[PDB]
Design a protein around this motif. Structure first.
Motif, PDB file in Angstrom:
ATOM      1  N   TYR A 194       9.221   3.160  -5.580  1.00  0.00           N
ATOM      2  CA  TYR A 194       8.642   4.429  -5.159  1.00  0.00           C
ATOM      3  C   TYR A 194       8.705   5.426  -6.309  1.00  0.00           C
ATOM      4  O   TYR A 194       9.760   5.600  -6.930  1.00  0.00           O
ATOM      5  CB  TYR A 194       9.378   4.977  -3.937  1.00  0.00           C
ATOM      6  N   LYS A 228       6.051   6.334   0.870  1.00  0.00           N
ATOM      7  CA  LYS A 228       5.033   7.238   0.346  1.00  0.00           C
ATOM      8  C   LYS A 228       4.709   8.353   1.332  1.00  0.00           C
ATOM      9  O   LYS A 228       4.578   9.519   0.940  1.00  0.00           O
ATOM     10  CB  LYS A 228       3.768   6.453  -0.005  1.00  0.00           C
ATOM     11  N   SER A 229       4.578   8.022   2.613  1.00  0.00           N
ATOM     12  CA  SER A 229       4.209   9.005   3.624  1.00  0.00           C
ATOM     13  C   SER A 229       4.729   8.532   4.978  1.00  0.00           C
ATOM     14  O   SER A 229       5.527   7.594   5.064  1.00  0.00           O
ATOM     15  CB  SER A 229       2.691   9.225   3.632  1.00  0.00           C
TER      16      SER A 229
END
Lengths: 49, 49
Positions: B16, B1-2
């Motif tokens: 994801y 995600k990050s």
């Protein structure tokens, strides 16, 4: 001399075989790379791999 | 995600989502499996050993 907005280019594809190397498939909008080339053809189903 | 913080361990294998429409285990359109791998055959160069 234009922007290739792939957000609509990958489109509502029934199955987009976007097996890509050298870059994550989502991080291309921020990229400001050089010229691009376009070419296409049609191949029998089995040997697309 | 990050991006993750320094000295951190994450093991989550959850699907994801990038272009919305979560697959919920389908692993198909607009979703990619977080975990990948590659072969380790001896006939590889120094850039893949």
């Amino acid at each position: 001399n234009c922007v290739a907005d792939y957000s609509v280019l990958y489109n509502l594809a029934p199955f987009f075989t976007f097996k890509c190397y050298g870059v994550s498939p989502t991080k291309l909008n921020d990229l400001c790379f050089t010229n691009v080339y376009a070419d296409s053809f049609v191949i029998r189903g089995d040997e697309v791999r | 995600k990050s991006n993750l913080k320094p000295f951190e361990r994450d093991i989550s294998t959850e699907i994801y989502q990038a272009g919305n429409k979560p697959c919920n285990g389908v692993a198909g359109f607009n979703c990619y499996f977080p975990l990948r791998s590659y072969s380790f055959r001896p006939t590889y160069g120094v850039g893949h050993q």
